[PDB]
Every structure is written in C-alpha cells, then in structure tokens.
Amino acid sequence: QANLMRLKSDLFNRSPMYPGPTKDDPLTVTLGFFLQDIVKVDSSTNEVDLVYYERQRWKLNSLMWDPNEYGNITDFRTSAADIWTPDITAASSTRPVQVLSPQIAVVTHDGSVMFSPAQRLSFMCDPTGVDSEEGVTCAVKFESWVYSGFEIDLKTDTDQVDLSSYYASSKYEILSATQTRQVQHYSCCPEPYIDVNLVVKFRER
Amino acid sequence: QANLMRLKSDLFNRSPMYPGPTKDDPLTVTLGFFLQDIVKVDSSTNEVDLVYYERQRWKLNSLMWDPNEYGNITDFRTSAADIWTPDITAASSTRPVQVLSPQIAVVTHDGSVMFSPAQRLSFMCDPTGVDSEEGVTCAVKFESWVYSGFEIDLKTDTDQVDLSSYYASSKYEILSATQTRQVQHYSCCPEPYIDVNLVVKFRERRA
Amino acid sequence: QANLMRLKSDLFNRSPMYPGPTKDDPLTVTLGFFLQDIVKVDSSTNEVDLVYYERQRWKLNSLMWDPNEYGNITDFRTSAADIWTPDITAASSTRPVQVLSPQIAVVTHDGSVMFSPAQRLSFMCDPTGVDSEEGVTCAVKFESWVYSGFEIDLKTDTDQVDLSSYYASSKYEILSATQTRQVQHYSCCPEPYIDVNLVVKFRERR
Amino acid sequence: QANLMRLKSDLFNRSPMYPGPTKDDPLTVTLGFFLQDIVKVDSSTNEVDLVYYERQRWKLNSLMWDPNEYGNITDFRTSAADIWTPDITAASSTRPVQVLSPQIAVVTHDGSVMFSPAQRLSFMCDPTGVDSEEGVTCAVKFESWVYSGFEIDLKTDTDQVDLSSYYASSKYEILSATQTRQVQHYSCCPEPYIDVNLVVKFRER
Amino acid sequence: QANLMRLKSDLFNRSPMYPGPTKDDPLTVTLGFFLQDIVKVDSSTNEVDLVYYERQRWKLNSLMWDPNEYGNITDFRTSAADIWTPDITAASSTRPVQVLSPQIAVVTHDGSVMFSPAQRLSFMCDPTGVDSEEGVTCAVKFESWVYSGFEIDLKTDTDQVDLSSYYASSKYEILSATQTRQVQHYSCCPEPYIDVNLVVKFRERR
Ligand SMILES: *[C@@H]1O[C@H](CO)[C@@H](O)[C@H](O)[C@H]1NC(C)=O
Ligand SMILES: *[C@@H]1O[C@H](CO)[C@@H](O)[C@H](O)[C@H]1NC(C)=O
Ligand SMILES: *[C@@H]1O[C@H](CO)[C@@H](O)[C@H](O)[C@H]1NC(C)=O
Ligand SMILES: *[C@@H]1O[C@H](CO)[C@@H](O)[C@H](O)[C@H]1NC(C)=O
C-alpha cells in the first residue's frame, strides 16, 4: 500500500495532468466494442437502445515508471477524474449516455491507460424489417467531438465486435457486428476526419 | 506538452475565471444551430423533442496569449468547467435540456472560445397539421436567462440552420429552418433582451 | 472585469454569507409567478404538471456597495450558490421540482437580489371537469419550509399571475390565474407561516 | 445577524461535526409522520407511492449554547449539510426516496435539532382489496440502516399519524394510520434492533 | 464523542485513502445477497427489476486501531465517501443501479469494514414462463469492473442467498436462489477474472 501511495503521489501530485494532444504531439486512441444486449427498438421514433462496453486505450510517457522502484507494481487502478481521458462520443445519440460501470481506469508501467466504461446508448436507427429473416442494419459513428485527425488518431485492434458477453435470450439476435475505422478526406482541406463506425445487423429472435 | 501545460496553468490557475459581462464591458455571443433529428412529437401534450448541436462563440481578452511565448501554440481544448460559458437557454423548454456530448471547448490565442454542446430538448409546440403536405411550424427562442441586451448581445453568422447532419430516415422531414436575431421586451424587466428565434417548418415523411 | 472581480471578492470572500433572517431582523421576500404552460393532467393519479418561472426578490444590507468605488458597476450576475436564497417550496408537490433555467441571480448595488428560476412542477390536483366549459380550479401554496411569518414575510407585487409568456397553443386555456398572500397554520406550531397561494382556473381548449 | 454569524462560526467552524453515537454515548431519535397523499397504487408491480413529511428530532450537547452570550438567540436554521443527521431509511422502498423540500434543519439552544424532510416514497405493498369498502392495509418499516439499538434508540411521540395535511381530493381515503416502535432481539447478539412501523389502512374514494 | 472524533481524525485526516489492491498486496472481498423483492418483469424488452441488499466485507491494516487508545471504541460508522470501497458491478444491468439506502459503512478495530448498500437493479432476463408453475430462471453476474483475481479475490461469505427479508406479498415468489463464485481464464492473459453469479428461479404468485 505504501508503495502504491508513493507511486500515485509521484505521478499525480508532482506533475500536472496531461493537457491533451496537439498537432505537434498527436495521440493514438484505440477503441474496441463489447456488445451485451440490444434492449429495445422504437419504430415510432426510429430509436434503438444498446447496452455495451467500450475499451479505450492510449499511451503517455508522463505516466511511465520503473516497477523495481515501487515494490514491483506493474499496474494500478485510479479514478478517471485523476487523469486525462479522451472525448469520444456517439455522433448520433438521441439521449444522454447512461453510465453502468464505475469511472475507473487501469494505468500500466509502460504508460498505457485502459478505460472501459459500460454504457446504455439510444441512437438513431430505422428498425423497419427487424421482424423479418433478413433483419435490419444500423450504424453509429464514434468520434472525438473536438480533436481533428491531426491531434487524435482513432483505431481499432480488431474489426469484429466482441459478442462473448451477448445475452443469449435477448429479444434480438445478432447476424453481424463490425467496428471499423473510417477516414474521410475533403478536397478543400488537408486534415483527415476519423471515426470508428459500429455497424450491427440484427433481427427479432 | 510542457508548453501547453504552462499555458493552461497561466490562464486558469493564476487568474480567476471571467466574472461575466457588465454594461461597461458587454459581450457578443454568436449562435449557430445544427439540427440532427426531430425525434418525437406529442399531440396529447403539445411537446416536440429535438436533437441538435449549438455552436456558441465569444471572445475574451483574459484568454489571450502570444503563441511565440508558448511554442507557437495557437489553440487548445479544455473542459467547459475551466471557463465561463454563457447562460443561453431555450425559453419554452418543458424538461431540463439533456446534454449528449462531452463538455469541452476550444480556446484560440486571440481569446476566441468555441463551445458546441449537443442537446436533446423538449419544447412547447402544437403539432396539428404535421401529417399534411403543408406541414407545421414551430419556434423556440434562445436567450440569456439573466443578461439583458446591454450585457450580452446575441447574433447569428447565418440565417439558415445547418441541415447537413440531419438524419435521412427521421420520421419527420424539414421543409424550412431559420435562425433569426430578435429584440424582446418582457413584463418583468425594463432592459430589453436579445434572443435567437429558431423557426422550423416540418412534416411527417411519406416514405 | 477587474472592478467586478474586486467587488465579488469584497462581498463573497471576506465576509461570510448572510445567515438568514431572525425574529429581531425579519426579511420580506416578494414572489411573482409567470405561467408558461399547463403541460399535462393525470386523472388516474390526480396530478397536474405546470411549467412556469418564479420571480423572487429580497434586499440585504450585507450585499450593498457604492458604485463609485467599483467603476460605476450598479449590478452583476452570480451563481445562486454564492448567496443565501430563501427556502420557498411548493407545499403540495408530488415530485421533485425540475429546474429549467441556470441557477443565477442578479444583485444590485442597493442590496436587492432577483432570482427567477424556471421550473416544471407536478402537484396534487383533481382535474375532473377540465373537459367542460366551466373548467377546473387547482391551487398550490408556496411557502418557506422552515421560517415563520416572524422571520420571512412573503408578499406579491400584484394579485394577477403574469400570462404574457403563456403558450398560445397549449392544450389548456387559462380562465383565471391569481397569486394571493395567505396565513397558514400548522398543528405543530403556534407561529403562523406566510404562503402565496397560486390558484389557476383552466380548461381544455376545445 | 452578527450574533447569529458568531454563533454558527463557534458551533460549525471550530469543532468538527458530531461523529455519530456509540455504545458509550447513545442517542434517542424521535420520528413522527405527517401523511399528505397516497399518489398511486400499482397492482401490476405491487408498489404504492406516498407523499409525506417526516419529523426527526434528536438532541446533542455539542450544539448547546447560552442565549445570553449570543444576543438572546434561542434558535436558528441551517443547511442539513452543516450537521450530522440520522440514517433513517424505509426498509421496503422500491425506488430511491425523492426529496420534495429544502434540506434545512432547526437547531435550538438546548441542543435539540428538528429536521422535517418532505418525501415521495415507493414501497412494497399488495393493493388487492383497495377498491372495496374494507380497503387494504400496508406497512413500511423505518430504521437506522447501520446503528443498532445500543447506539440509536428510535421512538415516536405519538402512535397516531398526523392526517391534518392529508389532501381532501386524493384518489384514496385513509381509514387508519399508526406509527409504532418495534424492537427485535436476535439469538446471535446482545443488541436490540429498533424500527418504527408505519401501518396505513386505505381504500379508493 | 471526543474519543471517536480523535479516532476519525487520526484515520482519515492524517493519512490518505487506501489506494486499492495490487498484485503484490491483494485483497479478499466477500459478497452476500439479501433479496427483498422482484418488482417487475418486462417481456417486451426482456428486463427484470430486483430490489436487494448486498453485504460487502473486506479488511485493511490501514484502518486498524487499539481500542485502549480511544476510550475502548471497538467500532464506528462513517460515510462510504470517507473510505475506499470495492468497484463491484452488475455486469448485465440495463440501467444505472439505483441506491435505496444511505451510503454508510461499519469499521471495526481489527480493520474490518462492512458495507451493505440496498439497490434496485434492472438486468437482462427473458421472463417467458414466469406465469407457469415451473417458473423461470435468471442469472446476474457481479464482478469487479477493473480488478482481476490477482488483485481482488472475490468470494461469498455464505452459501445461502438470504430470503428472510423477501416480501411475502410480492407479485413473484422465489423457488430457488443461489450465489456462486466463477473464474474465467483467457488465452491472452495469465490473470483469472472472477465473478459471483446470482441465480434466481421464480414465478408469479397466484
Ligand atoms: C515481479 O513481478 C513479475 C510479474 O509476475 C515477476 O516476473 C517477477 O518475479 C517479480 N520480481 C520481483 C523482484 O519480485
Ligand atoms: C516557432 O516558429 C518560428 C518561425 O516559424 C520557428 O523559428 C520556431 O522554431 C518555432 N518555435 C518552436 C519552439 O517550435
Ligand atoms: C461614473 O464615475 C464617475 C467617477 O468620478 C462619476 O463622476 C460619475 O458620476 C459616475 N456615473 C454616474 C451615472 O453616477
Ligand atoms: C476501558 O475499560 C476499562 C476497564 O478495563 C475501564 O475502567 C475504563 O473506564 C474504560 N474506558 C472508558 C473511557 O470507558
């Protein structure tokens, strides 16, 4: 405990918080989605509600340490308020995101940070054809609200959405679920626009 | 990072927050609306729900810096809790406005601030005629709740509401959407208020 | 800005907040209601929902200043958390009051404070007869939860509720809306309370 | 106001907050209920919703003063955040208690504190027979969540629930309403566990 | 009171909060469930709502004291904000867990902490067959969100789900209720991931 207290003090009390990336010092953030349940579908309003968690990872040199100097501690957990976190947002949400997990992150000795908030999300989606055999396809884009592709680069570690925690007796069954980095370039402008597109194909079970 | 950390420390940790405008030192705020979706319409209660984001811009001398003194940094991002933001409110909302985006602002070296919160709003609107070809018109005023036109002047950069992010498979299609500066006098108060009136003409999509 | 920063520092950082009125130093608070919309009516539960804002005004000597000493500043805006505010409550609400406006007050150099929160309120009311020509009457009392009439006196400046912000195409139309100072007696206590009774007569816009 | 400011400063700024009762220094808390309205009854979920206010009184030597030393002030009002308050809870609530009044208490010079929060409560109750002439009886227990009867003794000042503020045009009428202290002793342990049982008999009007 | 005030000051004001367990200094946390009511069932969305309380126990050397030095105080109560608490979460909730009790823990002189929050939970469960004699079976997993089995070793304090506080006139009756630790190992990683699985068999009471 003494070792961890000394480590947290050295990281958080001495130096200030990471102020965020700039064009000179950009930051890669990796996203992965873990789908738990398609809870409901509203054809009256074209809204769908998803429960999932979202693994976010980035790496900062200011959060590095030598385990030997701190009783061989290789990682620790801390409140997400104690560190900078990225502003990743669902671009087409229709209600505030409801947080289902504690807001706590894992920091490892190489300066890697992992933050995995569980969420209930309502987003825009026309569910006509969900009651058929072919099903329906909906998509939602995740992006940094205020950082361009020159400051925050988004990527995924895999293209497959993890369905290992997907509830077997959900009202809706998953035909397909992918997560894909998309880069948009406009003729006008030099900076790319980056998003991660979550595409889910599903139908009534 | 060192340069940005020093800059944020100089701006936020040394000086206090901007205390808001006065009659001697008024402030112009520019508003632009970006409509995403008319989510629902309730004829039983005459309430309509809109999803949109709202670009707010203002300029403060207290947030200025010289890029040369901070490694040529021309701008940065910060939590909206770190700065004063204006008290712009929908005057006819029926439920508290729900925030859909992170509360983060962009500050540039000339002291300009840009803050663009995404929002879900329920407001008063009679939707009779939405199922027709002519559609229905609703209006909602946005204004400072407590600053008169002598302290906060509102403007728009354009009169056309941006529909580029509008959801193609919405139940409702937009016939027209304008944003217009107005001057209001209220029974409460002798000082006039400035509002931006968002007027949207829409109907059920025949799809 | 320098002048306003110095003023706010002199008022809020040096002295403590006003601790509230006592029997020796009572306080008058003026209330006006501005009705916006009767949003819904629930006959299954006898609940009605109102959207309105409530203008509250009082005066404190501890919030006075000389404009000459502060660049001719005659007033300013500040978070309602920075000042004492009165504990005015709807006595017959059935749900917590939902706040629709920022919690910000106007303070003027004579020590006058104006605080005007916009609110959605659910309160107890039997709406039988709302679909008729005569309509229905509902009433809700606003009062200090813990200060008697010897500490907080409530008044209104007018007996007519302001309907200038009332939504023209509301499902419900207003036949009458008054705001009236009363004295309220509780079994518990010998001291009377002052309330403002908001009485609204309305019907379906047929 | 100078006298009241000095008094509040002497009580709250100098000493810390009362840390709660112990077995050596127990505390009596008195509870009284004032019923305003039975708002709804849900037979689909066996939930009933009540609006009421709850008078809580206790007495602390740490909140005593001599009126002569403070301009003859015999009492004052203060935010409930400035003082310790008891952890009285409805044991059979089905939703978080919703607070309908400002969180403010009255403190008197003998160290008595009165705190009377207005509340909307959903609690477990089977309302079968509410539409009959006999009506239906429901009960809800109030207790300290973490203090045993050796630390907090609960009592009522009367056994009759005050119905003087009960809404005349409620959908439901009250046939009877009592509030009664109950003590439970367990084989395991020496300490008694105390609750106040609020029993309400009612029917459709 | 003086003794308890001095104790709380020595524990909380001098030292910082316990920063959480590590691989070098792991922590055992016990969970036990006390089921109060199955409030509702939604077959349209396959959601069920449960009211229960959850007894959590762990032990820390940083919260130890000698009763002789503090007027023979063997235990006290404190706000859960004053201490580290474990990050136990329902992994299959569909809405944020609603807290029904005050957030207060019991700390004893050997450094044992007991924290028992009451909660309303909506979780994923297909209730087809709840209206039958056989009933329906649902499960909900509880786990530390961010601590592996190398940091928090999570277990049950008892083998029985306590049904003694279960409401007799609930719409639903409990046929069976178990609580069980489960361990998962992944190809990626050496550390085990632990959950406690609450399995409840129930049906409509008629
Ligand atoms: C430090 O921990 C690592 C991780 O398991 C292990 O390989 C090593 O044996 C430990 N070293 C010491 C000095 O304890
Ligand atoms: C800032 O810009 C000037 C001119 O382009 C350049 O010489 C200088 O190296 C820059 N300063 C830093 C610290 O990068
Ligand atoms: C503004 O300040 C100057 C300071 O000398 C004073 O002469 C003047 O009277 C003030 N304005 C008003 C309207 O009082
Ligand atoms: C602690 O216990 C001793 C007996 O061993 C007793 O005499 C003493 O009074 C106790 N202390 C307090 C403060 O009660």
Numbering used by the authors:
A (entry chain D), D (entry chain B): 20 to 224
B (entry chain E): 20 to 226
C (entry chain A), E (entry chain C): 20 to 225
Quote what the paper states about this structure:
Protein-engineering methods have been exploited to produce a surrogate system for the extracellular neurotransmitter-binding site of a heteromeric human ligand-gated ion channel, the glycine receptor. Acetylcholine-binding protein is a highly conserved ortholog of the pLGIC extracellular ligand-binding domain (ECD) with properties similar to nAChR. Mutations affecting key residues in the orthosteric agonist site at the α1(−)/β(+) interface affect the potency of both activation by glycine and inhibition by strychnine. We therefore set out to generate a high-fidelity surrogate of this α1(−)/β(+) orthosteric binding site using the 2α1:3β stoich­iometry [Fig. 1(a)] by exploiting protein-engineering methods and the thermal stability of acetylcholine-binding protein from Aplysia californica (AcAChBP). Ultimately, the highly stable AcAChBP framework has allowed us to introduce nine amino-acid substitutions that have resulted in a stable surrogate for a heteromeric neurotransmitter site that binds glycine.
Variant II therefore reverted back to Trp164, but with the inclusion of a G162E substitution. The residues now changed (Thr53, Gln74, Tyr110, Ile135 and Gly162) correspond to Phe72, Arg93, Ala146, Ser157 and Glu202 in the human GlyR-α1(−)/β(+) orthosteric site [Figs. 1(b) and 2]. Crystal structures of variant II with HEPES, tropisetron and strychnine revealed that the G162E substitution was accommodated with the structure essentially unperturbed compared with variant I, although now incorporating two charged residues (Arg74 and Glu162) to polarize the binding site such that the principal side is negatively charged and the complementary side is positive. The complex structure with HEPES showed this crystallization buffer component binding in two orientations in the orthosteric site in a similar fashion to that reported for LsAChBP.
